[PDB]
A paper describes a structure:
We purified a Der f 7 construct (Asp1 to Asn196) and determined its crystal structure by molecular replacement method. In this isoform of Der f 7, residue 130 is a Pro instead of a Ser, as reported in other Der f 7 sequences; the other residues are identical. The model of Der f 7 was refined up to a resolution of 2.0Å with R-factor of 0.224 (Rfree  = 0.28). The electron density for the N-terminal residues from Asp1 to Tyr5 and the C-terminus residue Asn196 were disordered and these residues were not included in the model. In the crystal structure of Der f 7, the 11 β-strands are arranged to form an elongated, curved anti-parallel β-sheet that wraps around the long C-terminal helix, α2; this is compared with the 10 β-strands in Der p 7. The N-terminal helix, α1, interacts closely with the 4-stranded β-sheet and the C-terminal end of the helix α2 to form a hydrophobic channel, likely for ligand binding. The ExPASy predicted isoelectric points of Der f 7 and Der p 7 as 4.90 and 4.85, respectively. Superposition of Der f 7 and Der p 7 showed that, with the exception of the N- and C-termini, the only region that is not structurally equivalent lies at the loop between β1 and β2, which harbors the largest conformational difference between these two proteins. Notably, this loop contains the linear epitope residues, Leu48 and Phe50, for the mAb HD12 that was found to inhibit IgE binding to Der f 7; these mAb epitope residues are unique to Der f 7 and found to be replaced with Ile48 and Leu50 in Der p 7. The putative IgE epitope residue of Der f 7 and Der p 7, Asp159, is located at the start of helix α2 and in proximity of the β1–β2 loop. In Der f 7, Asp159 is located closely to the β1–β2 loop with a distance of only 7.7Å between Asp159 OD1 and Phe50 CZ.
Author numbering:
A (entry chain B), B (entry chain A): 6 to 195
The structure:
């Protein structure tokens, strides 16, 4: 209970420190190119896309999703925690170029990452270096792709949207993990 | 986008209708007993437990996590939705009897289900009747078990907590889906 309290405090303080530094909102994400192919009822959509100027906004709203899950295990405390965003979606903004045959338009897009959650684990020996032991951005359960000037009924939208989501689940999630993990680790492990 | 706003609104209306239902909050969960075995190390824990008077609270705070994820595919509008709880946890209370050796205490516990979320899918033909084509209570990302009278440092805590968490992931999730899924289906399908 006192231990739960102080772990909660370590986490909140680390969150505050990270939010304070800026660095994290907006967060830059490296460009990413990908190739797509889908057959959709007598129609074929095969081509290529490029995302540039990708920025994640909203992590300034990060907050603990509740008490730490804590168990004393043989003279070492083990804690597991959720940090999500609170007062927003996490918003991804970027320029999109794609190619389909002779068409190669560009537009801008906002992608909504719903229920962004970081799961992290800690360890505390009776003395006494708090060690962060795992850090992961959970799988995005729902991503909404607002592709500038593209109607959602346009058969190509569904193709582009599904590809962008897969890219977010794979490429972008792992990049966000690579940025967030050392930041929390330096704050916690002090 | 109007189609999205329409789908959002149907979801918002169904949530409101379901939130007033009763049997939703508090929701009863059938009694459950489990014979468990956990290996921690050197020590080894075989035993049994029984949960009774299980009640889930907080579902009256259900709310969409953002826009419906919407796209047209082959003349069908397809929508994917995330519904969580806003300004609350989902909290489970219950009586707990457990047995380890002829240790056989009884107590009461509060379990915190963090980031409780339901994901659902809809299809909307212009033909055409709206069907809910999927519904899932997502894996709980973190559960905090507050077991009356029992210290987080007590070696028996970690064991019961882990067993209770597995029961939540399996039995409790299934039981909540049993209540929620046909309630949403009924609302959304007329």
């Amino acid at each position: 209970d006192k231990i739960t309290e102080e772990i909660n405090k370590a986490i909140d303080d680390a969150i505050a420190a990270i939010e304070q530094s800026e660095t994290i909102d907006p967060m830059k994400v490296p460009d990413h190119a990908d190739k797509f192919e889908r057959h959709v009822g007598i129609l074929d959509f095969k081509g290529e896309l490029a995302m540039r100027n990708i920025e994640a906004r909203g992590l300034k709203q990060m907050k603990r999703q509740g008490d730490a899950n804590v168990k004393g295990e043989e003279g070492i405390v083990k804690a597991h925690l959720l940090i999500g965003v609170h007062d927003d979606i996490v918003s991804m903004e970027y320029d999109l170029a794609y190619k389909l045959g002779d068409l190669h338009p560009t537009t801008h897009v906002i992608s909504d990452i719903q229920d962004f959650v970081v799961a992290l684990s800690l360890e505390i020996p009776d003395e006494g270096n708090i060690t962060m032991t795992s850090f992961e951005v959970r799988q995005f359960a729902n991503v909404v792709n607002h592709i500038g000037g593209l109607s959602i009924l346009d058969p190509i939208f569904g193709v582009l949207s599904d590809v962008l989501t897969a890219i977010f689940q794979d490429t972008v999630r792992k990049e966000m993990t690579k940025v967030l993990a050392p930041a929390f680790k330096r704050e916690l492990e002090k």
